[PDB]
Amino acid sequence: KDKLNPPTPSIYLENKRDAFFPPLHQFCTNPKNPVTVIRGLAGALKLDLGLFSTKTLVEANNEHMVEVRTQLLQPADENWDPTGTKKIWRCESNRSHTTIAKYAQYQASSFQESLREENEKGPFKTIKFGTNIDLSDNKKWKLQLHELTKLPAFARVVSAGNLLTHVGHTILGMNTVQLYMKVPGSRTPGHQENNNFCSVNINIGPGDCEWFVVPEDYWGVLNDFCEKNNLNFLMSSWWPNLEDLYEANVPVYRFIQRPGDLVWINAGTVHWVQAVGWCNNIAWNVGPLTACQYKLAVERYEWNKLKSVKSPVPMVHLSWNMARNIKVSDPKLFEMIKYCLLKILKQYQTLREALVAAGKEVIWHGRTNDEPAHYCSICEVEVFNLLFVTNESNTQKTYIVHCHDCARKTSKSLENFVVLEQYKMEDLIQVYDQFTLALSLS
Ligand SMILES: O=C(O)CCC(=O)C(=O)O
Ligand SMILES: [Fe+2]
Ligand SMILES: [Zn+2]
């Protein structure tokens, strides 16, 4: 069907008024729109994209680290096995590091070489893609990060309506900006965002990017394809074969992102991207306060546990911060958070009572203001409140955190561990009891 090649939801902006118009925010966060392309966004806000040009970046922090992916330059929208015999999902994406200065040299020489060639199945050429460049440090990137505060609030890296702001600590590349330096064919293979959070991406130019998008509710189909092909959906590099998707009745949105266009990837939307020209991009995540965002983040948090993959977003910590600090006025979102908090509380009460009944001391440890969430040093599951720390790490005050299961596996009666408690039961109960639905007429 042509239902399988649907039009891209698109907003055409001319000025600041259009950027700040509330129906824009509502359109982006509507779960029926898997992606929204906001055309002309940089022009409409007079955003200086020159602050993100390769020349500017080299002048600012020439030795800054760049993760390099070395990839094959594949034709059009296809991915061929290295022999050029058949189309397959697995893609070659070998990893190394470089600096902004060194990648910039390659990006520029790549272009000059193409000019020279223009003045003249595979085998394919190799290219390098500069990815995951960390723009978190405000003392290194002051002017760059300041420019992004010109965005409307809903798309900012930091805002009161962004769940990632309510985490209360840094999650690199999610509530901090990542930069991408590209040459033609540079590919970001198929993925959903970490914990299914929305993503914001602005193309710096001067070249274009081509995007491929599949709605969230088809992700199981793509997971199945990965498994049938010996690939890990979450952890492997794959580039979908569009003919497979079409055969499976999976709709694919496909579009070009020009310099100054902002791409809003909605919660859980599956996507893969390739540079058509030479360009840089910037991106980060946002978490709208909607039932849909929270539900999908929780779902992926739980799926990640089943797949033994770390969740970058500590959904337990976050849920407590929401209850402590956010007046929630949507009944559906409210009931979800409340439901999660009750599960957390009851599991905590069950575990704490079992420890005490076995005669294990629970040590009052408290918490430093703004301390990040903890994850198990062995299995990387989030660990909330009750921390299992070895007698030796306790003595040394390194406080190396384990979950209960990992501690028990090591030490059958927890004889090798102390149990540290960061929050009093009565204090968590009060937060839960006082978390009630606020009235909004909106
Ligand atoms: O620009 C890229 O290659 C990264 C795109 C992406 O995955 C995102 O913005 O979420
Ligand atoms: Fe992405
Ligand atoms: Zn563990």
Numbering used by the authors: 880 to 999, 1023 to 1344
Structure paper excerpt:
KDM6A (UTX) and KDM6B (JMJD3) are KDM6 subfamily members that catalyze demethylation of Nϵ-methylated histone 3 lysine 27 (H3K27), a mark important for transcriptional repression. Despite reports stating that UTY(KDM6C) is inactive as a KDM, we demonstrate by biochemical studies, employing MS and NMR, that UTY(KDM6C) is an active KDM. Crystallographic analyses reveal that the UTY(KDM6C) active site is highly conserved with those of KDM6B and KDM6A. UTY(KDM6C) catalyzes demethylation of H3K27 peptides in vitro, analogously to KDM6B and KDM6A, but with reduced activity, due to point substitutions involved in substrate binding.
The first helix in KDM6A and the linker region (residues 886–902 in KDM6A) that connects the helical and JmjC domains are not observed in our current crystal structure of UTY(KDM6C). The UTY(KDM6C) JmjC domain contains 13 β-strands and 10 helices, including the extended and distorted double-stranded β-helix that is characteristic of the 2OG oxygenase superfamily. At the active site, the nature of coordination by the metal binding residues is also well conserved, with metal binding by the Nϵ-imidazole nitrogens of His1093 and His1173 and by the carboxylate of Glu1095. Analysis of the electron density at the active site supports presence of 2OG in the cofactor binding pocket. 2OG coordinates the active site metal in a bidentate manner via its oxalyl group, with a water-ligated coordination site adjacent to the predicted location of the substrate Nϵ-methylated lysine group (as observed in KDM6B and KDM6A enzyme-substrate complexes). Notably, the unusual (within structurally characterized 2OG oxygenases) presence of two cysteinyl residues (Cys1111 and Cys1181) in the 2OG binding pocket is observed in UTY(KDM6C) as in other KDM6 subfamily members. In each of the KDM6 subfamily members' zinc-binding domains, the Zn(II) is coordinated by four cysteines, Cys1278, Cys1281, Cys1305, and Cys1308, in UTY(KDM6C). Comparison of the structures reveals that the Fe(II)/2OG binding sites are highly conserved in all human KDM6 members. Superposition of the three structures implies that most of the hydrogen-bonding interactions in KDM6A/B substrate binding probably occur in UTY(KDM6C). Notably, however, one residue, located in the loop between the JmjC and helical domains and which in KDM6A (Ile1267) and KDM6B (Ile1511) appears to form hydrophobic interactions with Ala25 of the H3K27Me3 substrate, is substituted for a prolyl residue (Pro1214) in UTY(KDM6C) (see below).
